[PDB]
Every structure is written in C-alpha cells, then in structure tokens.
Write a protein that binds this ligand. Structure first.
Ligand SMILES: OC[C@H]1O[C@@](CO)(O[C@H]2O[C@H](CO)[C@@H](O)[C@H](O)[C@H]2O)[C@@H](O)[C@@H]1O
Ligand SMILES: OC[C@H]1O[C@@](CO)(O[C@H]2O[C@H](CO)[C@@H](O)[C@H](O)[C@H]2O)[C@@H](O)[C@@H]1O
Ligand SMILES: OC[C@H]1O[C@@](CO)(O[C@H]2O[C@H](CO)[C@@H](O)[C@H](O)[C@H]2O)[C@@H](O)[C@@H]1O
Ligand SMILES: OC[C@H]1O[C@@](CO)(O[C@H]2O[C@H](CO)[C@@H](O)[C@H](O)[C@H]2O)[C@@H](O)[C@@H]1O
Ligand SMILES: OC[C@H]1O[C@@](CO)(O[C@H]2O[C@H](CO)[C@@H](O)[C@H](O)[C@H]2O)[C@@H](O)[C@@H]1O
Ligand SMILES: OC[C@H]1O[C@@](CO)(O[C@H]2O[C@H](CO)[C@@H](O)[C@H](O)[C@H]2O)[C@@H](O)[C@@H]1O
Ligand SMILES: O=N[O-]
Ligand SMILES: O=N[O-]
Ligand SMILES: O=N[O-]
Ligand SMILES: [Cu+2]
Ligand SMILES: [Cu+2]
Ligand SMILES: [Cu+2]
Ligand SMILES: [Cu+2]
Ligand SMILES: [Cu+2]
Ligand SMILES: [Cu+2]
Lengths: 345, 345, 345
C-alpha cells in the first residue's frame, strides 16, 4: 500500500548512535528497526548490586533510533520465549493507539510489527507500557529508550543558521528502585516477578535508590568516558522516561539546548543547566573549547555523586589560557594578609 | 465608581468550563463570580479512602473562571457557618494584597467581595492562603483552582496566527498527604482539625500518598472519560497549586503548549511532555488525529498508575493507517529467526 | 600577559549586591574578587537548630559577583588554617577545568588565584566541588553562590527594548539535610566531619529538612524584609545549586523572567511562578504596582511555610483601587442567601 523504499537500520548500543545523515536529500523511506526484549539480571552499581532488569536490545537505555521527518518507522518488536512477561512499546514520537502500545502487546514467543509516521521532529522517549501498574514497573525496570526525528535539512538554531554535530551521544538516565532488607542491604531476586511486590513498595515512595546513566553507576566514567576533541560540536541527547533530571556539563555549557526536545522550537543559548521533564528527551549541542575531563551530571549533586548519575568526557586538545588560567598555584596565605578585618568575621 | 456593565457568570464543576467567548468584541465588564467554601469528607481513591477535604464550590479542583484581559473580576467568597475554619483566596492573576488573600479572610458565617483587574493574560492558579502553616494545609486539602484570562482577540500561536479550541477541559492535579497507621492503612478523622497534626507530619516529608485529577483516582476514567472527536482542537488547562507535574497525552502531543501558562508568550510546538511548576497553571492545545482511548497522565508513571494521576479521553472518528498501522499482528517468532547472533546477546 | 585595567570589587553580604553599572561604556577589565572559606556552626531555623555550615565569605548563599561580558574574573580563593577541609570553586559561568574546580583545590592555610573569561551572559551558580561525595556535601553545607555576567549594554527584553532595575536582590535558596535522633529532634555536632556520616544518610533520601533563603528560616522576614517602592523595577536573582525551586511573588508577577537565567535568551513575560533548575540561577524583573507586604516563596507551599522558604518584601507607596479593591468587607452571609440551591450541594 505505502510503496516507499525500505532501509534497514542496524541499531548500536548506547551511548553510541547508529550511522545516519543530518541533512538529507533522500525522500521519505520506510526505516526498518528491530527491538528485541531482554529480561535479565544486571549489575547497576560499583558495589555489584544486581537487579532484575527488563530491556530493549539488552541495554539501559534502549538504543537511539534516528530517522527524518516524513519517514515511516517500521518496528519489529520481539519478545523471546525466554522472557516471563508480556511487553509492548509506546513511541512518544507516534500518533495513535497510546503511541503504539495498544497495537504491540506481545507474549513471550511472539513478535509484532508496528509502523508509525515520523510527523514530529525532535528527540522523544519510547518505553514499554503493558497496562496499569505494569507501566511504571516495566519503565523503571529499564524498558525505555529514545528516537530522534531530524528535520530533512538537519538542525538549525531557529534563527535561519544550520547547526551540524561532529559527534552524538545518547545519555539515558534511569531511576531505579531497589528493595532493601531490615539491615539496609539491597535485596536480590531470582526473577522480575519475585522482585515486583517489594519493588512496587519502593516505587510508591518516589525516591530512587540509584540514578544511573547507561544502566549503571560508573558506566560512562574512566575507561568508558565519552571522547571528544577541542573544536568538535557534540550533540548530547538526554532522556528520562519517568523522572525529572537537570543535566549539566561541568566546565562547559549548552550552546544550543532544546530542553523540551522538539526541533520546531528554537533552542535556548548558553545554558548552565537544563531540565529534562520525566517522560521526555532533550538535547544539547556544545562546542568544546578546552581539553581535559568534564563531568556530565544531573545537578542534583547527591544523585550525581552518591546515586550513580555522573558520566565523563575526556577531551583532547590544547589548553586555552585566555578562557581560564591558574594565575597563582596554591600557596600559604600571606602572613601579612588581614582576612580578620573582612566584613563577615 | 467603576461604572462598567456587570455580567454574572455561573460556574460549572471541573473538568467542564462555563460558557464563554474566545475572541470577543465586547468591552471590559465587571465579571461576577461566587465561590462558596465547602469543608467535607471526600473519597479520593478506588479503594474508598476518605480524607477531610476543603474546597471551593465542593470540587477538587475549584471551578475554572474565564474572563478577558481588561475585565474586572468581582468575586464573592462565602464561608458557610457549617465550616470550621477561616478561609480566603489568593488569585495568582491579581496584583496586590497577596493576590487578594490579605483582603478576603472570612470566618464561618461570613462572606467578602473582592475585585481584581485582569491585567495579565494566561491561566493562573487561585488558592486559599490563611497564613503560616495554614497556607499549605488548605491548599493540599483541596482549596485551589484556576482562572483563565484570555486575550480579547482569543489565543494566537505567537506568530500572528489565531488559534481556536473546539473544546476545553480543566484538569486540576492535587497532591494529597493522607496519614497511615502503624499497619500502613490510611487513617480516617471526624474533622479537618483532627486530621491536621498527622497530615502535617506527612506533608513535611514532601511525598504525596495520592496524586489525583478532578479530586480522586479514576475521576476522569471509564464512564467519566473526556470526550472528543477526530479533527477537534482541544485546550487542556492543567494546574498544580503546590507541586510540579509533567503532563503527557499518550498517543498524542501538545501542538501548542504554554507550559508556564501565559499567553503573552508564544507557545512551544509539538511537545511530548510538558511541565507545570507547582504554583501554576499551563495549557496545551491538541488537534486529535486518531480515534480511540488516550491516557492523559503526569509522566511520573508511578504517580500516574499507582497514586491516581491518569485521565482518559475517548475520541470518536476514523482510524488513519498512514499515521500508524499494525503491519503484522502478534505472531510466533520465525523458528528461522537468528536473534542469538544479535550484537547485545 | 593580559594587560587590561584591574578593578578590585568589594563583595557585600546577600541579599544585597555590591555596586556595579548595568550599561557600561568601560572596556573589558580584570575584575578582582576575594572569597574566603568559613566553616562554622550556624543557626538555620526559628527554633534555634544549628548545623555545621561551610560557606564562602561567612554567608549562605555566598555573595553575588557582578561583571560584564568580556571581563576577566580573577578570584583569590582563601582557605584559612582554622578550617578542617579542603575546598575549591566551580564557576558555572567559566569554561574549562570543571569550572575552575580542577585548578582551585586548596588545603587549610592555602589560597589560590583563578582567572576566567566572562564569555557567557546570565546569572550562574558557583559552588565548591572537592571531588566525589564531597561535592554534594560541601554544596548542601552552604558552599554555593552566584555570579551575574551582564551584557555591556545592560539587560534587554529580547525585542530591542532596554530593561533597567532600580534595585537588585540576590535570593540564594539552600536545601539542608539535618540529622534527627530516634525522638525526631535535630542532632548537633562539634565539627562538620563529625556530622558527615549522619548527614550523608539524610542526603541519600533526597528530602531536605529545611529549605531556606539567605541561610535560615525567617532570614528575610520581619525586620529583614526586602524594601521596595511602588514604581521600582526590581531584579530578583534566585539560585539553587542542588535542587529545583519554583519562585513566586505573592500579589505580584514576573514581568520579565529568565528562568534558565541566560541573557542571550529573551525573557518570558507575565509569569505567575517560575522554575529554577537545581544547579542554576535565574532572574525575574518586577515593577511594583501596589504597596504592602509581599511574600516571596518557593511555591511548594509546604517548603515555603513549613521548611523555611519564605522571604518578604515591604513596599512603600499608594494603594491602587483600580488594580484591586475590597468591594465589601467581611459581613455575615445574607439570611436571604440561597446557597443550598447551588449545583454542587
Ligand atoms: O507539526 C508537525 C506535523 O504535525 C501535524 C499532525 O501530524 O500538525 C499538527 O500541528 C500543526 C502545526 O502546529 C497544526 O497546524 C495542525 O493542526 C496539527 O494537526 C502535521 O500537519 C504537521 O506537518
Ligand atoms: O543505607 C542504609 C544502610 O544500609 C547499608 C547496609 O546495612 O548499606 C546499604 O546502603 C548503602 C547506601 O545505599 C549502599 O552503599 C550499600 O550498597 C547497601 O548495602 C548500610 O551500610 C547503610 O548505613
Ligand atoms: O503586561 C500586562 C499588563 O501588566 C502591566 C501592569 O499591570 O505591565 C507590566 O508589564 C509591562 C509589559 O511587560 C511593563 O512594560 C510594565 O512596566 C509592567 O508594569 C500593564 O501595564 C500591562 O498592560
Ligand atoms: O503501603 C504500606 C502497606 O499498607 C497497607 C495496609 O497495611 O496498604 C495501605 O497502603 C496501600 C498503598 O498505599 C494502599 O493500597 C491501601 O489502601 C492502604 O491501606 C499494606 O497493604 C501495604 O503493604
Ligand atoms: O555565546 C557566548 C560566547 O561563547 C562562545 C564561546 O566562548 O561561543 C559559543 O556559542 C556561540 C554562539 O552560540 C557559537 O557560535 C560558538 O561555536 C560557541 O563556541 C563565544 O564565541 C561567544 O562570544
Ligand atoms: O518531626 C518528627 C518529630 O520530631 C520532633 C521532636 O521529637 O520535632 C522535631 O521535628 C520538628 C519538625 O522537623 C521540628 O519542629 C523540631 O525542631 C524537631 O526537633 C517532634 O516534635 C516531631 O513530631
Ligand atoms: O558544576 N558542577 O556541579
Ligand atoms: O506514553 N505514556 O506513558
Ligand atoms: O500565592 N502564593 O502562594
Ligand atoms: Cu515491558
Ligand atoms: Cu509515555
Ligand atoms: Cu481555606
Ligand atoms: Cu500562590
Ligand atoms: Cu568546600
Ligand atoms: Cu555545578
């Protein structure tokens, strides 16, 4: 019925993004994606805490899908017979049938094929939503990702100037609700169903035990730091399917930020910290101007430092002393200093 | 002193809205409204939990008032002698005297008449605010609503195009703080004053026990779903007098969203999820393009599914297979499938 | 190497702001500031609760620094030998080295001199960030302030009209996490290090015990209310280094609000309530139109009334009955009233 060309897309694991064009002269295509549900125990923190995760394609977040405005997205959702639970998918990018949820409920051993027209530009959450209390539980178990629908002319600054990224990273932020025993130790379970009742009790109090990027504390630090170079314009897509976040690049800015995540709106310029409303994706462009380590956090610093929500960028390049310089290295305070005359003493 | 024409307005119970014009050629009027305080026990959840509510006109939220820029709003606030508590009203739309609170404190058996000039366009919270700790307690007991001040030319897209709604609904979202006994069961009381001390202890921990639309879990689901038709442009006014919310229409979008709720600002286009800051109203326009059930949620899905914060729209019309279609109904996974070669296994 | 003129700035205690120009015809300068770290026990609430604070210049918040775009900011950070902890500083305004943190770690008895170029306009957080879990702990112990980088032409409305304030106030909002004993009483400690382990446990649950302006409940009420006059345009800078806030001026508005706090973006007009994302500063201009007391709150009214987050403005001037008037003072309800016929009874 459609007859458009069909293009198969091979998804890649976050924080990386499958190859795509920003600007394109190709016409609308049917862009074919496969997502395979995987329930599995995963390690979420640096102490080895495990929890019964439920994922799209084995990762938290699910992979970033990228298409262009006016493409059709044909998703094969697969629920392997090794799974225990029904699953489905809601695309916040899509129109109708609860974002596709009402057309994609599949039992273990089943798959389903949904097509949705990419009529709305931006970054959007996709997440599982089987019904009722199963909706939050599948989402905070890991079952959420994002899709980016680019304008065919690529990004602009909303003032008639093209914007182009050298690199793109997808940061999925996950709130997790891990039960504790009477001693305060995280509990383990043999299956998601066995973890449910105790997890729902934690969920109800609305306070995550962990807030993680790329599915675990430390996922995107040290060896797995995100690479960049001075002069590169980097797009940082950030999603949170359930809970607000306030992203901040420590020692940088958001040059161009779509915090509500929709490219029909002009981005804000020069932000320190932006805001991802729970149930959405946003995006920030930044041109690195200085080398070194940058931390990328939610700027609830308790969440960032103590519940897992810090990533690192390692940026190669030459230091710019005009932007910042240490004028005097740490030195003993002048014995002659008169700090005891200061107005606040 | 004023001499302008006086127009009496009959308020209607949320989520409906009293009849009004969007664009008008009438000049400024004195728009006369009556709000009557009602303290009463109300059922808030589907298990029959009751709590000692305090309301404007017997509803949570209070009714939506609609006037036009440059109208004067003359509110008679009535505090029946059957009430136990002083009450007042703060209009976030109004200028001076703590929004009118400092001019409207009335004991049981009293009424008061306040006039405020509608100088600021948008949707705004109104709420009770008697002083001190009584301010949050009266508000999270139910004593909040909204007023919409339309431009005389009606809504625009901020780019010189008129916007007109076919239908308007008012979604008041209420955080509730219901005490529990040592067993975890919700406690009942014979009066608001008797509930206060235990409720303040819950309030202090900043975690609601319920987050409800139109005063109770399930208020706007099943039989009470909101009606619409394909092709109708629907305005959805959302308020939260105390606590942030992140509205989302599942399977739809916000075509035009004023999340900060003020019509002097151009709306954002094509949002997935928006943000109502506690202490404000916002509004979203959406043109329905697909029939069926839509859920309207705060996209903290735990709040939505587990603490009461889901409404439904039932939309009549023809399905558009071009926007979305089920290409293949659920089927067993191809025995020939090679999902064990997938990159994440 | 730089040779620009050097201008020393004497900081003043919040909520006041050191003298500065809005529009300037001076060229870029090296603006010299000194911040001295002070660890000290401070009183945070009206019951006399103390906690082991850590401050810049003895205040919560740290003082507001004001410079202009293209100035260089040369900060001497001093860590007196009477302190117990290493400290540093991260300027969200600055580019490189984690905002300066990675260049400013100083032990007790040391100082350091950092220069950063003011390339980004707006209000920005600065805060301590020594590393790891010490980052949130130093920030929620008090170690955060703000810097404003004005355009050289001063503020504009983003529509080619100059905006000028008559007065400026800096409201730093602080989330505090004070341990409680088994009885619910706040605990005291002899040193920050002794308070740490019990404070980290409170921090982890993400629910402050206090949310204060200018370092304590009641800091900016009664005798310390903020002064203004009818007709004055007041800039209200609001920062929160760790946690979201929703500012509201009760009986007023935000005429011009930069809630994300960056002057390259046009402000929103006529807001009721705005949103400061944790890790940022924002700013609102308001022209007072009515005299009397205004409360300035976070519009989580529980936080405002019950956890300390209310300031007052006392505004001198003549009452404008056209904007608002009490038409009828409180009176007994007309015996003849027919309120029992009302639709909601
Ligand atoms: O806006 C992107 C895309 O959405 C559609 C619906 O699929 O239009 C919606 O938004 C338009 C612009 O705001 C409105 O004019 C329209 O009424 C609404 O349906 C597409 O038409 C549009 O290309
Ligand atoms: O958090 C309370 C209490 O629980 C203990 C175990 O008894 O540690 C648990 O909690 C810590 C913070 O979440 C985790 O680091 C640890 O993994 C977990 O087992 C106590 O150490 C702690 O005081
Ligand atoms: O903005 C709506 C309405 O508010 C008033 C005050 O009642 O003006 C305020 O905002 C104006 C536009 O931002 C400012 O120019 C003005 O200084 C401020 O008092 C009305 O004048 C206006 O019609
Ligand atoms: O929530 C804790 C604990 O309390 C119990 C009663 O002992 O149930 C209460 O809490 C539930 C969630 O809020 C409610 O559904 C119910 O209405 C309430 O009485 C336990 O069932 C629960 O485990
Ligand atoms: O934007 C203020 C200031 O920031 C700099 C970097 O110091 O520019 C950044 O943002 C510009 C405008 O968005 C971009 O064009 C640029 O690529 C980015 O580095 C300065 O150049 C500018 O004056
Ligand atoms: O808050 C719980 C419980 O603790 C007590 C002391 O036993 O009071 C403490 O908590 C109050 C609220 O935070 C504070 O006003 C007071 O300063 C603090 O000591 C009880 O009174 C209260 O019920
Ligand atoms: O600047 N980072 O917390
Ligand atoms: O798309 N709704 O959770
Ligand atoms: O209007 N203040 O809560
Ligand atoms: Cu699922
Ligand atoms: Cu959703
Ligand atoms: Cu009241
Ligand atoms: Cu209010
Ligand atoms: Cu410090
Ligand atoms: Cu920071």
């Amino acid at each position: 019925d459609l007859k458009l060309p069909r293009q198969r897309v091979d998804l890649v694991a976050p924080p990386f993004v499958h190859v795509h064009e920003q600007a394109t002269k190709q016409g609308p295509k049917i862009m074919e994606f496969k997502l395979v549900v995987q329930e599995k125990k995963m390690v979420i923190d640096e102490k080895g805490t495990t929890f019964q995760a439920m994922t799209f394609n084995g990762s938290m977040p699910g992979p970033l899908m990228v298409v262009h405005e006016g493409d059709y997205v044909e998703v094969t959702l697969v629920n392997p017979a090794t799974n225990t639970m029904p699953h489905n998918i809601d695309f916040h990018s899509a129109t109708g049938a609860l974002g596709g949820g009402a057309l994609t409920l599949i039992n273990p051993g089943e798959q389903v094929v949904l097509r949705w027209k990419a009529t709305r530009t931006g970054v959007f959450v996709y997440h599982c939503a089987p019904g009722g209390p199963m909706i939050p539980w599948h989402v905070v178990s890991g079952m959420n990702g994002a899709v980016m629908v680019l304008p065919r002319d690529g990004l602009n600054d909303g003032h008639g100037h093209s914007l182009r990224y050298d690199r793109i990273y997808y940061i999925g932020e996950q709130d997790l609700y891990v039960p504790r025993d009477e001693k305060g130790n995280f509990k383990s379970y043999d299956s998601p169903g066995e973890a449910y009742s105790d997890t729902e009790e934690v969920m109800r109090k609305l306070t995550p035990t962990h807030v993680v990027f790329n599915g675990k504390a430390g996922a995107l630090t040290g060896k797995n730091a995100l690479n960049a170079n001075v002069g590169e314009n980097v797009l940082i897509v950030h999603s949170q399917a359930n809970r607000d976040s306030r992203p901040h690049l420590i020692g940088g800015h958001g040059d161009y930020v779509w915090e509500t995540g929709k490219f029909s709106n002009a981005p804000e310029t020069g932000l320190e910290t932006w805001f991802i409303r729970g149930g959405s994706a946003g995006a920030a462009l930044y041109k690195f101007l200085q080398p070194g380590i940058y931390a990328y956090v939610t700027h609830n610093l308790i969440e960032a430092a103590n519940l897992g929500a810090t990533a690192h960028f390692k940026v190669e390049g030459k230091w710019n002393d005009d932007l910042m310089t240490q004028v005097k290295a740490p030195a003993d305070i002048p014995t002659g200093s008169t700090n005891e005359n200061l107005y606040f003493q």
